[PDB]
């Protein structure tokens, strides 16, 4: 039962109904959260900090309960950030022109001064265009909105940019978020999921999109924080567009397992440990699906020559046995490398079905103390891969 280091410093969640069991389930894998509101969720307000979280209050629009916000900040001095207006460029959200959003900003600056907070700019996305931006017909444009906001907010304290995105193509997401780097402030992606343009065709597509975009954000130094939309949805995890991270109390969905398992660039796994397959530091080709296996929640799926790499901090050199939890309708071959060198091949792995699971163990593999890359390579095979375990 190896206690791993903090999996990510950037990763957060957008959700307002956490239990303590929910925070414990994500502990050490999620750093922060917000709930669109002025104080932490009632059932975790007393104890959230003891599980490693910081809570980020929000002033959703200019009519936010300032008394409630200041009272919360009086009792929670670890709070470091405050989020400004939610989608002011949407008539159905905060509904403030750039000039109005700037005119109300001093209320937030006074709170930031009083409690030593940094401020996140109002969150924007492409909009229906029903909040006017002066000087353009392109009222839908989020950069034109922020340009006008900053021009009106002369001298304002704005430490970070907030971005929402509902595109479903990872290359569109990276282009879009990258456009906000022009303002020379670290970015918080405070809501995203694949949803527009028809959205995901199935849960696996959303899991793949989440993986691609989380991995891009972990590697982009200009991204400060990100939070998936959202913890739980009213319709639930298996209904389009498959949003939920949390399932039953204190438990994750398949998508939430992917979200919480993906490591930062600098995180390193300690061993002996079981490591979820979806916690790879690097994936080439591998895709994601839910699994019906008796443990675990998500699986990687190979169809050809896919590669997954896991970066290890081996504190005790020695001979470790590698177990893989696998499903394979035909014969699968899987090559295992350490720092690029072949140490073992699983040969003719066959379970008889895509959700017929077995655990397969290697011979002992010599690992010296230090940093190593464990590489799991499909050799022209079709299989599912739930988790791995290194034992000594
Ligand atoms: O239900 C209301 C709801 O609205 C939310 O805000 C929406 C907002 O999300 C929406 O944004 C669209 C956006 O999805 C669209 O993305 C484009 C990219 O601009 C484009 C740039 O390269 O890439 C994409 O992916 O197109 C290419 C693919 O078609 C193709 O396959 O090739 C590439 C992939 O290989 C892709 O690049 C995307 O399609 O962009 C348009 C503008 O161009 C945005 O409008 O816009 C809505 C209004 O029109 C908003 O309402 C809001 O957050 C939420 O609160 C609210 O509830
Ligand atoms: O500050 C005072 C104002 O309080 C307003 O009540 C807010 C309430 O609106 C807020 O609801 C949020 C939604 O804003 C959020 O909508 C999503 C968008 O943020 C996003 O961009 O798009 C998605 C679509 O994909 C929207 O669903 O969704 C979350 C989660 O469902 C809601 O919690 O919540 C605040 C905290 O509870 C609450 O204060 C009120 O409407 C104003 O009249 C009032 O002035
Ligand atoms: O001109 C109409 C504009 O409407 C907006 O809602 C869209 O996001 C733009 O892509 C489009 O060009
Ligand atoms: Mg798994």
Author numbering: 82 to 473
Authors' own words:
The crystal structure of CBM6E complexed with GOS was obtained through cocrystallization of the E168Q inactive mutant of CBM6E with laminarihexaose (L6) and determined at a high resolution of 1.28 Å. This complex structure enabled the mapping of two β-1,3-GOS chains within the catalytic groove of the GH128 domain: one spanning from the -4 to -1 subsites and the other extending from the + 1 to + 5 subsites. The cleavage of the glycosidic bond between the − 1 and + 1 subsites might be attributed to residual enzyme activity of the E168Q mutant enzyme at high crystallization concentrations. The elongated catalytic groove of CBM6E aptly accommodates the curved conformations of the two GOS chains, which collectively form a single-helical structure. This structural characteristic correlates with CBM6E's preference for linear curdlan over branched laminarin, as well as its distinctive cleavage pattern yielding products L3 to L6. The interactions within the negative-subsite region are primarily governed by two conserved hydrophobic residues: W141, spanning from − 4 to − 2, and W117 at the − 2 subsite. The glucoside at the − 1 subsite establishes hydrogen bonds with N167, Q168, H245, and E272. Furthermore, a β-configuration is trapped within the − 1 subsite, which aligns with the retaining mechanism observed in the GH128 family. We were fortunate to observe glucosyl moieties from + 1 to + 5 in the complex structure of CBM6E. Furthermore, W256 and Y250 (corresponding to S198 and Y194 of PvGH128_II, respectively) provide aromatic platforms for the + 4 and + 5 glucosides, respectively.
